[PDB]
Amino acid sequence: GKGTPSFGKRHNKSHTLCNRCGRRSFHVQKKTCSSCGYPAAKTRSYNWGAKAKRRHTTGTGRMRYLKHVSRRFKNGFQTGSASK
Amino acid sequence: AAQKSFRIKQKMAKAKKQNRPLPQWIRLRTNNTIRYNAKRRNWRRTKMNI
Amino acid sequence: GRVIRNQRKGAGSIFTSHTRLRQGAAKLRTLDYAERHGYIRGIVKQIVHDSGRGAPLAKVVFRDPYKYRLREEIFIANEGVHTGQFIYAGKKASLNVGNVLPLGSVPEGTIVSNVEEKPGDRGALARASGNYVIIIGHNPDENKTRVRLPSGAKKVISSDARGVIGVIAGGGRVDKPLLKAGRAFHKYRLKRNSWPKTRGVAMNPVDHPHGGGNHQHIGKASTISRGAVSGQKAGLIAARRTGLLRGSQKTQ
Amino acid sequence: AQRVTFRRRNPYNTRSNKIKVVKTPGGILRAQHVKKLATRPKCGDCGSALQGISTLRPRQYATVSKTHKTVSRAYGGSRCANCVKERIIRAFLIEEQKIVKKVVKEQTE
RNA sequence: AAACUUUCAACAACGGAUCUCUUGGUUCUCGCAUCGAUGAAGAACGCAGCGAAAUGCGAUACGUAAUGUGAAUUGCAGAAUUCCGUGAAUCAUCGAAUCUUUGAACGCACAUUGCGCCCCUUGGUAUUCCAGGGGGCAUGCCUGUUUGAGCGUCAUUU
RNA sequence: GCGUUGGAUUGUUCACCCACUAAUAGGGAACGUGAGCUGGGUUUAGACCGUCGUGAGACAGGUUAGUUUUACCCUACUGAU
RNA sequence: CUCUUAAGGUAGCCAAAUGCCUCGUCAUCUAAUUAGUGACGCGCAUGAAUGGAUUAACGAGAUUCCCACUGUCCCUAUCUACUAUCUAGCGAAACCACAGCCAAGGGAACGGGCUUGGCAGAAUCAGCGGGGAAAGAAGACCCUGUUGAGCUUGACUCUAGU
RNA sequence: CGUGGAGGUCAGUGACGAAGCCUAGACCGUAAGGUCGGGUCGAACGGCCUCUAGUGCAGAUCUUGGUGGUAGUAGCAAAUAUUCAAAUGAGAACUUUGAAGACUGAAGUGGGGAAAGGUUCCACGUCAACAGCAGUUGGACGUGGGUUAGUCGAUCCUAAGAGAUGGGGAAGCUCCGUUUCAAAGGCCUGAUUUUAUGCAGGCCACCAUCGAAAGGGAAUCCGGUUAAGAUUCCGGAACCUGGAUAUGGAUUCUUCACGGUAACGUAACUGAAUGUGGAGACGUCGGCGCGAGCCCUGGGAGGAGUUAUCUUUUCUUCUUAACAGCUUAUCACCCCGGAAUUGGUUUAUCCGGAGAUGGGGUCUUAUGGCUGGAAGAGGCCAGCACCUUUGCUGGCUCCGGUGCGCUUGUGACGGCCCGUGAAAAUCCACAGGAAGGAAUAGUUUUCAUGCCAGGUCGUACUGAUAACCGCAGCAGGUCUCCAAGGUGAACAGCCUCUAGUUGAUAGAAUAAUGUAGAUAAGGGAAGUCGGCAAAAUAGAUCCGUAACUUCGGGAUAAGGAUUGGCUCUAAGGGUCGACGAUCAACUUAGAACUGGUACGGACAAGGGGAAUCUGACUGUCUAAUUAAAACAUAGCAUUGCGAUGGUCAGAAAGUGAUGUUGACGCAAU
RNA sequence: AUGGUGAACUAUGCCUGAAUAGGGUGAAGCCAGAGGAAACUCUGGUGGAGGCUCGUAGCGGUUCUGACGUGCAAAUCGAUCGUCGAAUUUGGGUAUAGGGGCGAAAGACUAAUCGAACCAUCUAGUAGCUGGUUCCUGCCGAAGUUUCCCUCAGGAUAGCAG
RNA sequence: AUAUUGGCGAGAGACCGAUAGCGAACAAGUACAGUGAUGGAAAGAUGAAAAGAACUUUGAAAAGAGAGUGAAAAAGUACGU
Ligand SMILES: [K+]
Ligand SMILES: [K+]
Ligand SMILES: [K+]
Ligand SMILES: [K+]
Ligand SMILES: [K+]
Ligand SMILES: [Mg+2]
Ligand SMILES: [Mg+2]
Ligand SMILES: [Mg+2]
Ligand SMILES: [Mg+2]
Ligand SMILES: [Mg+2]
Ligand SMILES: [Mg+2]
Ligand SMILES: [Mg+2]
Ligand SMILES: [Mg+2]
Ligand SMILES: [Mg+2]
Ligand SMILES: [Mg+2]
Ligand SMILES: [Mg+2]
Ligand SMILES: [Mg+2]
Ligand SMILES: [Mg+2]
Ligand SMILES: [Mg+2]
Ligand SMILES: [Mg+2]
Ligand SMILES: [Mg+2]
Ligand SMILES: [Mg+2]
Ligand SMILES: [Mg+2]
Ligand SMILES: [Mg+2]
Ligand SMILES: [Mg+2]
Ligand SMILES: [Mg+2]
Ligand SMILES: [Mg+2]
Ligand SMILES: [Mg+2]
Ligand SMILES: [Mg+2]
Ligand SMILES: [Mg+2]
Ligand SMILES: [Mg+2]
Ligand SMILES: [Mg+2]
Ligand SMILES: [Mg+2]
Ligand SMILES: [Mg+2]
Ligand SMILES: [Mg+2]
Ligand SMILES: [Mg+2]
Ligand SMILES: [Mg+2]
Ligand SMILES: [Mg+2]
Ligand SMILES: [Mg+2]
Ligand SMILES: [Mg+2]
Ligand SMILES: [Mg+2]
Ligand SMILES: [Mg+2]
Ligand SMILES: [Mg+2]
Ligand SMILES: [Mg+2]
Ligand SMILES: [Mg+2]
Ligand SMILES: [Mg+2]
Ligand SMILES: [Mg+2]
Ligand SMILES: [Mg+2]
Ligand SMILES: [Mg+2]
Ligand SMILES: [Mg+2]
Ligand SMILES: [Mg+2]
Ligand SMILES: [Mg+2]
Ligand SMILES: [Mg+2]
Ligand SMILES: [Mg+2]
Ligand SMILES: [Mg+2]
Ligand SMILES: [Mg+2]
Ligand SMILES: [Mg+2]
Ligand SMILES: [Mg+2]
Ligand SMILES: [Mg+2]
Ligand SMILES: [Mg+2]
Ligand SMILES: [Mg+2]
Ligand SMILES: [Mg+2]
Ligand SMILES: [Mg+2]
Ligand SMILES: [Mg+2]
Ligand SMILES: [Mg+2]
Ligand SMILES: [Mg+2]
Ligand SMILES: [Mg+2]
Ligand SMILES: [Mg+2]
Ligand SMILES: [Mg+2]
Ligand SMILES: [Mg+2]
Ligand SMILES: [Mg+2]
Ligand SMILES: [Mg+2]
Ligand SMILES: [Mg+2]
Ligand SMILES: [Mg+2]
Ligand SMILES: [Mg+2]
Ligand SMILES: [Mg+2]
Ligand SMILES: [Mg+2]
Ligand SMILES: [Mg+2]
Ligand SMILES: [Mg+2]
Ligand SMILES: [Mg+2]
Ligand SMILES: [Mg+2]
Ligand SMILES: [Mg+2]
Ligand SMILES: [Mg+2]
Ligand SMILES: [Mg+2]
Ligand SMILES: [Mg+2]
Ligand SMILES: [Mg+2]
Ligand SMILES: [Mg+2]
Ligand SMILES: [Mg+2]
Ligand SMILES: [Mg+2]
Ligand SMILES: [Mg+2]
Ligand SMILES: [Mg+2]
Ligand SMILES: [Mg+2]
Ligand SMILES: [Mg+2]
Ligand SMILES: [Mg+2]
Ligand SMILES: [Mg+2]
Ligand SMILES: [Mg+2]
Ligand SMILES: [Mg+2]
Ligand SMILES: [Mg+2]
Ligand SMILES: [Mg+2]
Ligand SMILES: [Mg+2]
Ligand SMILES: [Mg+2]
Ligand SMILES: [Zn+2]
Ligand SMILES: [Zn+2]
């Protein structure tokens, strides 16, 4: 055993989908995501994991508000209308 | 499992909807370096891992 | 180089007691006004087996003195206690088997069980099957009672500490050979994961002080100092003496 | 012979997955899941089964009239007849003994 | 003598080197200072006439509004060509909005699209049950408000 | 030129004895010969004993258990076109 | 009678899974026994819960003998299926300095090549296990390294705890 | 000498062809190299003087990529097996249909599920790749269709446990702890109805939450229907929960019912706080009783097969759900009565003056019976019409028997423990008597009927020699339910029915050597380290059985005999009224006869004995070279410890394990 | 070394479920009979005990040192075997995490990883040791010796060389 | 005044020129592997313009042979050399 016959007993997921990052790293029994650290308030990251930081950092998504913050700064956070 | 959570069924639905070849009117667009669906999945070759 | 088994027992992961089937903690009544000044009468409703325990328990129901309701208590049954028997607990209860009395209120030579170490701790001494405490005297000034414990030790206890008249039921239990690894198995299945025991001398040096060697042998004295540290205290910890006990006990 | 299947997704022979085999009007054999059998209500004094009281699973007693759950006596579907009679006799005799104890105490002083 | 083996050449293969390209990288310099409980970064799921992705977006869903430009978009289809016009556009700009489910994530939970409570309102006779719509209910801390507790304690009646 | 054996004990080489025989000669060939075998021994890891060592452990000391892989190529050889 | 120790191995047991000498000696077992068994014991170096001696039962434990039984053997033969074989289709891998006939010589002291001889004729198929000091793996033994690690101990230096 | 880039220069070369590449063509240089011609090609590039470097490859078991010989070679050989014809198609060993031969043989190659997968399900189109041959086929490719719930699950409960808060620790990420050193509370209502709230009357709190698709748990069945869904859809028939509710009934003039000696009965028949009790709720084995389904079987009413001959014959249909009404047990209980000549009684020895036997009753309703549901359904037939939807039309669907049978449910018991074999949600009942209650009338949604609503998510399919994991369509691994006939002790082996499959690349030969299966004269372990391997033995009945022994064993010791078929004989029973009548199933024993002396006829199935070493035994481990004498074990002994403790955790803690513990205990040997 | 991730394999405890033909033997208790002065004994039944036994499903893994050993397979296949009703087998839930766990103890197991897992970083760790080290021609051209070194496979030093 | 391998916006280079340069010039932190932490590629070039080969013929078809487009098919998307 311990090889092919023992691989046949693999039908119980140690991890399922994480609510916060969706990576299937949420340890079922520990109730903790091994990737993002959910449900801790901080997002798990390490400086030895530079590649992982790069994988999950700002700009890897759509940025959805922050992509416009820069234009709004450029225009000085104006509030009115363009006034034809 | 035939007794599945809604989350699992929803991911299954997304996978079914995106399990399709490249739309053939793409490859007619002006520049179109896209030749085929390079993200095509199949249940016999690569597991979704949920 | 490895953490030994007696060290691993303290973490209490697989070494916790198997308490699922137990009836509850076996305790006297809370030491209240009724027992401090008079007595209170309860009734024995059940004498029941407790998992992992040799002595049977007695479920004794008292009336609540301050609220209309019943208070069930889990006593350790003394030998001769029967269901439907009226148990009396307090300073003024009678010297009858099963009654709970302060140690001061019983004459010298009385046999009590489930004796409190301090008044109100609800029972600490002579709780195992067949065991009992013997009142060997009183010191009325500086009110105290001198008692003989099952181990033969003489102890001075407050004269307000309570005990149950009689001997814990279930005695003679260890007189029957277990006769079987299976019976030892079922005994400890309901107590804790302490069985079976591999001899340390049958292990490797990494696992135990006694491990290793081209023959199985301790190699050094098995009598270990009291000042030894965890991982060293295997064998006969702080042994005053070794060898077959020849002669009499009860030193002076 | 006709072999049957479980009708719920539970495939295991657990206490809540007991089946009988019934023949239907369609002429075929079929598994029928059977509920766990009821235990007779029992006396609170002696533990014997209470006569006259219906034996149902706990929540079915709410779907049944008072007659099925009681007996016309001083402790209904709670204590048996002999236990109630013993309670009557004990109460009466002990109250009488209490009166005579009070009189003895009042006349020994 | 063929066949076969080997060598070379031509043509054909195999393969993708070389050469030439380059909306990419890399390094240097200069300027600026702007994420988030007004919900950020990140995630899930959706959204197009015909899209799987990338990109964009959120049930107002490859977008709505506003402004500018001034006739497109384009793979097909459709629309339109008033287009001398408050007006095309997968345009630019962007100050108004929308912004599913989430997430520090905030009613309680979450391996559940699980379970409450309060207010307004609608329907089913309906304060109480069920349902629909809308709006809310986290924690710590600060200032203040109100209601309180303590023979901690003051005064007055006593 | 020709033959030079069958056995008891032993992993044994060696030895020793029984016995037949014409005779039971000595040797080599990578102490011929393990992709020919076998694996009893030795010589991993398990275990026991004795002596030694405070100990972990040592022992041409004893004891028991312990995976023996590949040829379809070239040659050689055997046959065959 | 000496020397001598804390005590000097007691009851038992033994060439025993512990005995070097050793295949010990005697007996038995056999035609023959370094095996087995029973005895003997100044026992290299047996021995008392580091348990001694023994034990019915049990044992995929080690061992000897006997009966039965047989292809284990004398001494081999034969049969069946599936291969191997040939074909249609399909179609890898190990390995590969270049390669592939010997004898001797010398040579890094055992050559496929070098020297001197023997020789030597296309292209091949099935087998085969002499050779390729064949393949598999930067030898695990041994040694070296001012390279480690597991483990131990009044090694050096410390440390949790107490 | 050569290479990438840089400053200068040759107003250098070039789409009339730069660079690159190929070229047994030419020239120069000792060489590194340079130059030219020809072919190919398409956009840039060079000489010289200098500058600069990521500047020159044969190696590094070098890196990446590509390619060979090996080589059309090794091989595609486990799971018994295929064959004929037709159809389709360009093409058929492999597809489809039919025919045949087989297998799985109910512990399946069948029918379903859990985990996992995720569309693999189904239809249509369709074969470039994949299915290590093939392919027209497919779990492939392309396009679509498909999963319907108040009752099945999740959802709810708690389990081992996880884990906020209050607090404490920690520099801190965070840790401890889970009711604790906390001001931790809402749900009820007199009054208030300046408003059913605040003030203001009074009753209950040692406490979040998560944790089971096998534990607990409200309630649904049958028939039909799809290409693919079904306890979900349709038809019919029920039920539960929450709510609203009006009638009828019941009750009240003695207000909150009557009856029975009683056990208790019923259509109802008030009941707050508070308390108590019950159910939920529980091990395992053994025999016995009973039920259900299945098995076997008789008659009869249908259909099919065989029919040279025989067979009143062989096969097959004959069914009845949830739910409802009436009725129905073992046990238990009540009344009468008073028992030794002790009786009753189980397979199993328990019970009786603490009241047996007996007579008469009460009860639980598992379960069975009848009726309703419901024959109108389903099933089996027959007679007609048919360009179709398909139409119909009738008939029968009945009555029994049997049991150490099988599966399962269950009851009353019995054995076992130093083991005595969950919890909570939830539901009910009782005690209590708060309060509320009638007379041109009050009371009663635990009686009947009636009205409304029951959300959300899952639901297809496989579940494996191809849908999971093992790199794959891998002889491996992966939890569970149902389970026919014969032989037989048997869920063994072997054959068969229903169902399913006929899938493993094939064809032709039959050398060596193999793998697997066998046989062998005479000898019988001489082989070999060694009886390795193989053989021999084997079932059942009867006889017989030693040493030794812990008296239990050893033991199937050893060692013998018998066994088929057939025709009989005897014994062992039920029910009913010393016997008679009727009915029924096997087990045992014996006899005669018989035969190529065969007969547990295949299958299945111990070799035995005398001893020694060693471990007592059963048990356990080196998954993947060691199963042992090693570990464990019961037994024995020693050690520590009386809780402000022993032993052991933690960085620390107002922190832990033992400990729901207490020396007959825990801890260490 | 630092910081993280794993108990889907497996080790052990706990919680909750599930699974295990047919035979042999025949313990207590009980019934009847016989014997005895008594103490008590004997016989036949009944019964159905046991970490009993033969042997299925299971679970395991002895031997063939069989098959295969470029495999069906990074542990399988066949036969033969141990065991088969309790220290049993097993699902799910749950706990224990790396000098840590867990261990009926083999240094075993802790996801093909174990005498200290896996992942990333420190890190291009150091190496007196092994391998490699890329164009031409021309001229000159060695040393394996001295002394010292924790030195003896290395260096410094002098010498030889440009 | 000083720092700035992040963010936003710019200008540059004796830098690299698709095995180079960031891992990623391209639907690159993508596909894919792992339970997980993490690991992590390969992959640019027809032509000026699709003018992407109408039509005929052989073939079941794929395709072939012609014809044709194009400066070139010694550019046919299996595309510069
Ligand atoms: K032990
Ligand atoms: K030791
Ligand atoms: K009743
Ligand atoms: K090590
Ligand atoms: K078996
Ligand atoms: Mg492993
Ligand atoms: Mg887990
Ligand atoms: Mg012990
Ligand atoms: Mg060991
Ligand atoms: Mg140690
Ligand atoms: Mg020590
Ligand atoms: Mg040892
Ligand atoms: Mg009743
Ligand atoms: Mg938002
Ligand atoms: Mg040799
Ligand atoms: Mg050889
Ligand atoms: Mg070999
Ligand atoms: Mg040899
Ligand atoms: Mg050997
Ligand atoms: Mg060894
Ligand atoms: Mg010693
Ligand atoms: Mg040695
Ligand atoms: Mg002596
Ligand atoms: Mg000796
Ligand atoms: Mg001897
Ligand atoms: Mg011999
Ligand atoms: Mg001694
Ligand atoms: Mg010794
Ligand atoms: Mg055993
Ligand atoms: Mg030669
Ligand atoms: Mg020579
Ligand atoms: Mg050579
Ligand atoms: Mg020559
Ligand atoms: Mg030749
Ligand atoms: Mg060969
Ligand atoms: Mg060779
Ligand atoms: Mg080496
Ligand atoms: Mg090495
Ligand atoms: Mg050195
Ligand atoms: Mg070291
Ligand atoms: Mg460069
Ligand atoms: Mg040119
Ligand atoms: Mg050339
Ligand atoms: Mg060009
Ligand atoms: Mg370089
Ligand atoms: Mg090269
Ligand atoms: Mg070189
Ligand atoms: Mg190489
Ligand atoms: Mg390569
Ligand atoms: Mg071949
Ligand atoms: Mg083969
Ligand atoms: Mg086959
Ligand atoms: Mg067919
Ligand atoms: Mg068969
Ligand atoms: Mg068959
Ligand atoms: Mg299909
Ligand atoms: Mg194929
Ligand atoms: Mg094909
Ligand atoms: Mg498809
Ligand atoms: Mg349900
Ligand atoms: Mg916590
Ligand atoms: Mg829950
Ligand atoms: Mg359940
Ligand atoms: Mg279906
Ligand atoms: Mg319906
Ligand atoms: Mg009435
Ligand atoms: Mg009676
Ligand atoms: Mg019923
Ligand atoms: Mg069963
Ligand atoms: Mg289904
Ligand atoms: Mg299915
Ligand atoms: Mg199946
Ligand atoms: Mg797979
Ligand atoms: Mg039979
Ligand atoms: Mg013979
Ligand atoms: Mg013969
Ligand atoms: Mg013989
Ligand atoms: Mg011999
Ligand atoms: Mg011999
Ligand atoms: Mg021999
Ligand atoms: Mg054998
Ligand atoms: Mg016999
Ligand atoms: Mg014997
Ligand atoms: Mg043993
Ligand atoms: Mg046994
Ligand atoms: Mg092993
Ligand atoms: Mg083994
Ligand atoms: Mg032992
Ligand atoms: Mg697990
Ligand atoms: Mg057995
Ligand atoms: Mg095997
Ligand atoms: Mg082998
Ligand atoms: Mg082979
Ligand atoms: Mg070892
Ligand atoms: Mg380097
Ligand atoms: Mg010179
Ligand atoms: Mg020095
Ligand atoms: Mg060297
Ligand atoms: Mg690159
Ligand atoms: Mg290219
Ligand atoms: Mg050209
Ligand atoms: Zn996460
Ligand atoms: Zn009672």
Side-chain angles (χ1 to χ4, degrees), chain A, chain B, chain C residues 1-251, chain D:
Chain A
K2 104 180 155 167
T4 302
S6 82
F7 296 148
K9 307 164 183 286
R10 300 199 329 195
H11 55 240
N12 287 304
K13 312 200 195 80
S14 283
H15 299 79
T16 188
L17 296 173
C18 166
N19 269 0
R20 190 150 82 179
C21 71
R23 265 200 56 78
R24 197 188 86 159
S25 315
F26 192 69
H27 201 268
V28 161
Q29 268 164 277
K30 273 142 89 175
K31 303 290 181 115
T32 311
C33 181
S34 53
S35 176
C36 81
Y38 182 81
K42 291 187 306 160
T43 302
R44 205 195 72 123
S45 75
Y46 295 99
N47 297 311
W48 51 258
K51 213 172 277 221
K53 297 173 91 75
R54 164 164 87 204
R55 279 182 199 107
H56 305 292
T57 193
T58 302
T60 61
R62 31 157 146 184
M63 276 192 41
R64 205 156 70 123
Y65 165 77
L66 200 51
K67 79 211 288 172
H68 306 123
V69 167
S70 208
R71 165 188 90 217
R72 289 165 62 231
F73 158 79
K74 175 182 87 64
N75 294 312
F77 305 102
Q78 51 188 2
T79 42
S81 276
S83 101
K84 208 206 291 293
Chain B
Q3 276 171 325
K4 46 181 89 53
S5 73
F6 178 80
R7 201 179 313 274
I8 302 308
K9 178 148 167 202
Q10 197 179 31
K11 290 202 107 75
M12 281 171 53
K14 185 193 199 57
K16 177 192 192 182
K17 265 175 305 180
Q18 68 197 349
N19 196 309
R20 82 168 277 191
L22 193 78
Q24 282 320 282
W25 58 268
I26 288 110
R27 303 185 198 142
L28 289 194
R29 294 171 319 165
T30 283
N31 294 115
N32 180 256
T33 41
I34 291 178
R35 316 287 272 103
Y36 76 111
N37 187 11
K39 301 188 167 173
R40 191 78 181 282
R41 190 201 45 93
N42 188 254
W43 70 278
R44 288 180 81 76
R45 300 197 281 276
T46 292
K47 288 319 196 182
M48 311 210 315
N49 295 326
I50 299 208
Chain C
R2 208 212 295 281
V3 175
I4 75 181
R5 177 194 50 220
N6 64 41
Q7 293 186 268
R8 296 176 25 232
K9 280 191 184 190
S13 57
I14 59 163
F15 302 107
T16 60
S17 52
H18 312 161
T19 59
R20 165 184 65 107
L21 293 174
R22 288 166 202 224
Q23 311 284 326
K27 283 157 153 36
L28 303 174
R29 291 180 75 258
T30 291
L31 182 59
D32 61 335
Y33 171 91
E35 264 169 87
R36 275 192 284 109
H37 293 280
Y39 62 87
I40 176 160
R41 181 193 90 165
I43 178 189
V44 174
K45 306 306 286 294
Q46 323 176 19
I47 294 154
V48 62
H49 173 81
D50 193 21
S51 275
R53 195 191 292 264
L57 304 178
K59 288 188 186 328
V60 192
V61 170
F62 297 80
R63 284 170 65 240
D64 195 329
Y66 309 101
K67 191 186 176 306
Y68 167 75
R69 46 160 182 211
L70 302 183
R71 251 73 190 80
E72 211 212 50
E73 305 288 327
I74 300 163
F75 290 2
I76 314 159
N78 272 348
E79 228 183 293
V81 174
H82 58 91
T83 40
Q85 176 186 337
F86 287 133
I87 293 311
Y88 301 81
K91 204 182 92 191
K92 298 315 202 156
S94 305
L95 200 66
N96 285 102
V97 164
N99 284 5
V100 182
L101 296 190
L103 286 201
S105 299
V106 303
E108 307 92 329
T110 313
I111 288 95
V112 289
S113 86
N114 202 10
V115 185
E116 300 189 314
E117 260 167 339
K118 312 272 176 66
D121 76 347
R122 302 179 73 183
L125 309 171
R127 296 165 54 92
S129 80
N131 280 291
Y132 55 86
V133 162
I134 304 164
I135 281 74
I136 37 186
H138 309 276
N139 310 338
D141 321 314
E142 188 81 13
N143 67 310
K144 290 271 167 39
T145 298
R146 308 180 320 279
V147 301
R148 219 267 309 170
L149 304 185
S151 72
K154 316 301 193 55
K155 199 196 223 310
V156 180
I157 304 194
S158 166
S159 271
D160 293 327
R162 295 165 300 164
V164 195
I165 308 298
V167 297
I168 302 277
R173 187 190 89 248
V174 295
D175 282 329
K176 197 172 159 196
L178 285 165
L179 222 65
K180 266 164 66 171
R183 298 205 179 165
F185 169 93
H186 288 300
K187 160 163 179 157
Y188 294 101
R189 172 171 60 86
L190 287 122
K191 302 166 153 281
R192 62 207 70 80
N193 183 23
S194 69
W195 182 99
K197 308 191 189 286
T198 304
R199 289 158 308 115
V201 95
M203 308 163 168
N204 296 308
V206 69
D207 308 302
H208 199 277
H210 299 178
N214 287 345
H215 313 266
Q216 288 194 1
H217 70 298
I218 319 286
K220 285 191 192 289
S222 51
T223 46
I224 304 299
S225 163
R226 176 78 72 200
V229 305
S230 297
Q232 292 190 319
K233 277 198 187 172
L236 318 183
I237 305 142
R240 298 162 182 91
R241 54 156 316 281
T242 44
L244 198 64
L245 277 161
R246 289 172 173 117
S248 28
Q249 304 293 78
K250 304 268 162 299
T251 77
Chain D
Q2 289 174 29
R3 294 166 276 182
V4 304
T5 51
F6 279 137
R7 299 182 70 173
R8 293 98 181 254
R9 287 183 181 283
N10 189 357
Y12 305 111
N13 189 55
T14 69
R15 216 171 29 180
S16 62
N17 211 33
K18 301 275 108 172
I19 58 149
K20 205 173 49 169
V21 171
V22 317
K23 198 170 260 170
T24 66
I28 59 134
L29 283 189
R30 186 180 283 147
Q32 270 204 344
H33 288 261
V34 278
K35 312 262 194 55
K36 295 190 306 209
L37 288 137
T39 297
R40 305 194 51 177
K42 274 153 188 62
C43 186
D45 284 3
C46 77
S48 65
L50 286 170
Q51 195 180 345
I53 284 93
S54 286
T55 75
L56 306 172
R57 292 308 282 199
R59 205 160 166 193
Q60 285 171 303
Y61 287 110
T63 90
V64 85
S65 84
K66 194 68 161 312
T67 282
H68 299 68
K69 307 177 268 183
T70 72
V71 148
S72 313
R73 201 175 32 241
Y75 271 76
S78 192
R79 266 67 175 197
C80 75
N82 292 7
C83 286
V84 170
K85 163 179 164 164
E86 188 208 292
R87 281 156 91 101
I88 313 290
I89 288 147
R90 202 183 300 279
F92 169 76
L93 291 179
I94 295 197
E95 292 302 308
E96 292 296 277
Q97 198 33 249
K98 275 197 211 163
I99 286 163
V100 311
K101 264 213 289 179
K102 176 167 208 243
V103 152
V104 158
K105 275 200 65 71
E106 286 165 1
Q107 309 280 263
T108 187
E109 73 155 322

